[PDB]
Structure 1
């Protein structure tokens, strides 16, 4: 289990940006949350990633990722502060070759259409794998500001939420090789610009499954392995109790 930046990412003090008691728990905290993720085929090119934003996946239900009573606790508290623990499985047989890169990317906008707002659930099914184009390498698709008719719109050539695709192994990562393992185990603590961020609008981590070596299998052999994942928050600290988000 690839722990991140500490020996124990479960250790977490309550936030110092609150005056109330944090809701440290909810009705099922020792259970996982399993969701689908798109299958990996031969036509997937190199570096074609697929991002699962946390906790952006519990809300939009990316791949049937039902949050149970964690989404219904996240909607009833304003500030949320947890460390994640993902587990991507993919049934790599002996008959496959290739290597996924499962990482937990801090603070990126990879679920954002390089041309608009936020992605839907149908548009995650049409493309199935986000190709590493010039936009995602240069960060040219994090959402541009509406400057207005007064200012002449500048030629946006760079944005600091890029992916350098050759450097994704700096993150907490395990390579899902064809002949070492079949599943990864990443456990990350809380990070953020504040001691606790918001609930509806935070993206402090991002599960990221990137194809480093394209899948090749013989015809008639085992075909097209499915990718699952299992997100589970470790020691959350919910602050600011209010009613359900509108």
Structure 2
């Protein structure tokens, strides 16, 4: 072992290599594995698809402004339109997978900032109006980032999610969000963040279009900054890889 700060990951067809990174946080202490034949209840045979599904699908990018609050994604839904993971997701009826989340954000030695890369299992949300429940087009984007705000929510539109960043939108203390697995991105000494998450859920296999497994949240606790005479555009990107996929219950598409 020489020069700890360099990693390398070759999963299937893609490879992501960082030179300046921290350690790798591996789930709750387990590596994602297939489903044993002692805990299954499906009566069909599964379908370990290919290397063609365990790949590195990169999602959209965004700009880290100087007033931005935070973004998030829904994991089983963000990869709905990507390659052969989005075809075996809708043609079948069941499935279980694990992911390998990644994040890139690189700045010079004259910038500053921080971020909290964390994934929350079973993330709920709260509508703006108390009586109603949130919409769907205001809860999940089509692999495009959803963003928090500074003002709380207003009183509209009776279905919008409440983007109150200091409460996280779930109704908890934002400082206590370090229980779920995570990693910090400090531009002083960091350039990325890796996270390996297994499949955590009550039932053995669950639908993909009806119930979202996890939720990826990004929150900058310390805003960007820089003196005059430097690049004012700092973008962010994320790369995710389905790990150990399986399916059951073949039907027509939807």
Pair in the same fold by TM > 0.5: yes
**2:225 equivalent in structure 1:** 216
Which protein, 1 or 2, shows the higher relative CO under an 8 Å CA cutoff with sep ≥ 6?
1
Residue 130 (structure 1) aligns with: 148
Given the alignment of the two structures, is residue 99 of structure 1 paired with residue 114 of structure 2, yes or no? yes
- Alignment match, 2:187: 178
> What residue number does 1:69 align with?
84
The superposition leaves residues 90-140 of structure 1 with CA deviations (integer Å, 9 ceiling, x where unpaired) of 123212211111111111145x86463123659x67xx63126667xxxxx
- Equivalents in 2 of 1:105, 1:133: separation in Å? 24
Tell me, yes or no, if the aligned pair for 1:26 and 1:70 is still in contact at 8 Å.
Answer: no
**Aligned alpha-carbon RMSD (Å):** 2.9
Q: 1 CA distance for matches of 2:49 and 2:136?
A: 30
Structure 1 residue runs of 4 or more that deviate by more than 2 Å after TM superposition: 112-116, 119-122, 131-135, 160-164
Q: CA deviation at 1:73?
A: 1.0
Determine the structure 2 residue equivalent to 1:29.
53
Structure 1: which 5+ runs fail to align? 60-65, 136-140, 144-159
On the 8 A contact 1:26/1:73 being kept in 2, the answer is no
- Could you state the TM-score of these two structures normalised by the residue count of structure 1? 0.76
Determine which structure has the larger helix proportion and give its number. 1
User: Aligned residues, how many?
Assistant: 212
Cα deviation, residue 88, structure 1: 1.0
Relative to structure 1, the CA distance from residue 193 to residue 134 in structure 2 (aligned partners, 3 Å threshold; closer, same or farther) is farther
CA separation of 1:226 and 1:51: change in aligned 2, threshold 3 A: same
Looking at structure 2, the residues matched to 132 and 83 of structure 1 have their Cα atoms a distance apart, in angstroms, of 33
CA distance in 2, matches of 1:132, 1:17: 47
Alignment map for 1:112-191 (pairs within 5 Å): 114=128, 116-119=134-137, 129-131=147-149, 161-191=170-200
DSSP-derived class of the 1:55 partner: helix
Structure 2 residue runs without a partner (length 5+): 1-23, 154-158, 162-168
| Separation in structure 1 between the aligned mates of residue 127 and residue 202 of structure 2, nearest angstrom | 24
Instruction: Say whether residues 1:3 and 2:18 are aligned partners.
Output: no
Instruction: Describe the SS at the equivalent of 1:166.
Output: helix
Query: What's the counterpart of residue 71 of structure 2?
Result: 50
Query: Retained in 1: the 8 A contact 2:72–2:218?
Result: yes
Q: CA deviation at 1:224?
A: 2.6
The two structures have a TM-score, normalised by structure 2, of 0.74
Secondary structure of 1:212 counterpart:
coil
